[PDB]
Amino acid sequence: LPMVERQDTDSCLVYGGQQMILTGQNFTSESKVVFTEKTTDGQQIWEMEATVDKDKSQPNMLFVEIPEYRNKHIRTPVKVNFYVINRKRSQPQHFTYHPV
Amino acid sequence: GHELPMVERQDTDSCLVYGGQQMILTGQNFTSESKVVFTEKTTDGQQIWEMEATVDKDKSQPNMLFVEIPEYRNKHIRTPVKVNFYVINGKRKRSQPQHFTYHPV
């Protein structure tokens, strides 16, 4: 199962478009990174696959481009999740987008 | 079930040392026997406190847990204390640690 032990970035501005490095175990050439957001009641209101640099990435490191957030006009920071998926998925990780 | 419990959000990140307020966890693979455990660790990562939190089983869903935040171990602190909590199904399938802060009174 993919495992995320740490991440070098916890937040960024809403545009995204910066690199995040994930350190962990059992990543492969086919690993995907997917960002999601739910409401408190569990309804999924966002999903966006993130671009992975498959040439730099290795079984214990993924090099990920943080996606543009769903709404670039937020006024307060928004908490989201991401997963590594080999549906074989990791625990959810935490990330925050901040307004411009 | 087979897949580990997962915590995607929490509606509360901190509270006073008194505890007692409800926290709602949103996630995956919760069951009627899911437990929530609050913990505290030293700087080198060893656990020095553990306290199970009461789950309101009459509100539980596979993707929501309704949790009574425990009182903190020492209500006489003068600075905030960072703690963790996790969801556990059975004896060993646990979520990764979540973060929580208790504030002094």
From Swiss-Prot, chain A:
In resting cells, phosphorylated by NFATC-kinase on at least 18 sites in the 99-363 region. Dephosphorylation induces a conformational change that simultaneously exposes an NLS and masks an NES, which results in nuclear localization. Ubiquitinated in endothelial cells by RNF213 downstream of the non-canonical Wnt signaling pathway, leading to its degradation by the proteasome. Induction: Inducibly expressed in T-lymphocytes upon activation of the T-cell receptor (TCR) complex. Induced after co-addition of phorbol 12-myristate 13-acetate (PMA) and ionomycin. It comes from the Eukaryota. A motif (Nuclear localization signal) lies at residues 87-88. Expressed in thymus, spleen, heart, testis, brain, placenta, muscle and pancreas. Isoform 1 is highly expressed in the small intestine, heart, testis, prostate, thymus, placenta and thyroid. Isoform 3 is highly expressed in stomach, uterus, placenta, trachea and thyroid. It is found in: Cytoplasm; Nucleus. The 9aaTAD motif is a transactivation domain present in a large number of yeast and animal transcription factors. Member of the multicomponent NFATC transcription complex that consists of at least two components, a pre-existing cytoplasmic component NFATC2 and an inducible nuclear component NFATC1. Other members such as NFATC4, NFATC3 or members of the activating protein-1 family, MAF, GATA4 and Cbp/p300 can also bind the complex. The phosphorylated form specifically interacts with XPO1; which mediates nuclear export. NFATC proteins bind to DNA as monomers. Interacts with NFATC2IP. Interacts with FOXP3. Interacts with TBX21 ('Thr-303' phosphorylated form). Interacts with KAT2A. Plays a role in the inducible expression of cytokine genes in T-cells, especially in the induction of the IL-2, IL-3, IL-4, TNF-alpha or GM-CSF. Promotes invasive migration through the activation of GPC6 expression and WNT5A signaling pathway. Is involved in the negative regulation of chondrogenesis. Recruited by AKAP5 to ORAI1 pore-forming subunit of CRAC channels in Ca(2+) signaling microdomains where store-operated Ca(2+) influx is coupled to calmodulin and calcineurin signaling and activation of NFAT-dependent transcriptional responses. It is linked to Joint contractures, osteochondromas, and B-cell lymphoma: An autosomal recessive disorder characterized by musculoskeletal and hematopoietic issues. Affected individuals develop painless fixed joint contractures in early childhood, have osteochondromas, osteopenia, and can develop B-cell lymphomas. This is Nuclear factor of activated T-cells, cytoplasmic 2. It comes from Homo sapiens (Human). The gene is NFATC2.
Curated annotation (Swiss-Prot), chain B:
It is found in: Cytoplasm; Nucleus. Induction: Inducibly expressed in T-lymphocytes upon activation of the T-cell receptor (TCR) complex. Induced after co-addition of phorbol 12-myristate 13-acetate (PMA) and ionomycin. It comes from the Eukaryota. A motif (Nuclear localization signal) lies at residues 91-93. Expressed in thymus, spleen, heart, testis, brain, placenta, muscle and pancreas. Isoform 1 is highly expressed in the small intestine, heart, testis, prostate, thymus, placenta and thyroid. Isoform 3 is highly expressed in stomach, uterus, placenta, trachea and thyroid. In resting cells, phosphorylated by NFATC-kinase on at least 18 sites in the 99-363 region. Dephosphorylation induces a conformational change that simultaneously exposes an NLS and masks an NES, which results in nuclear localization. The 9aaTAD motif is a transactivation domain present in a large number of yeast and animal transcription factors. Rel Similarity Domain (RSD) allows DNA-binding and cooperative interactions with AP1 factors. Plays a role in the inducible expression of cytokine genes in T-cells, especially in the induction of the IL-2, IL-3, IL-4, TNF-alpha or GM-CSF. Promotes invasive migration through the activation of GPC6 expression and WNT5A signaling pathway. Is involved in the negative regulation of chondrogenesis. Recruited by AKAP5 to ORAI1 pore-forming subunit of CRAC channels in Ca(2+) signaling microdomains where store-operated Ca(2+) influx is coupled to calmodulin and calcineurin signaling and activation of NFAT-dependent transcriptional responses. It is linked to Joint contractures, osteochondromas, and B-cell lymphoma: An autosomal recessive disorder characterized by musculoskeletal and hematopoietic issues. Affected individuals develop painless fixed joint contractures in early childhood, have osteochondromas, osteopenia, and can develop B-cell lymphomas. Member of the multicomponent NFATC transcription complex that consists of at least two components, a pre-existing cytoplasmic component NFATC2 and an inducible nuclear component NFATC1. Other members such as NFATC4, NFATC3 or members of the activating protein-1 family, MAF, GATA4 and Cbp/p300 can also bind the complex. The phosphorylated form specifically interacts with XPO1; which mediates nuclear export. NFATC proteins bind to DNA as monomers. Interacts with NFATC2IP. Interacts with FOXP3. Interacts with TBX21 ('Thr-303' phosphorylated form). Interacts with KAT2A. This is Nuclear factor of activated T-cells, cytoplasmic 2. The chain holds residues 575 to 678 of 925 of the full protein.
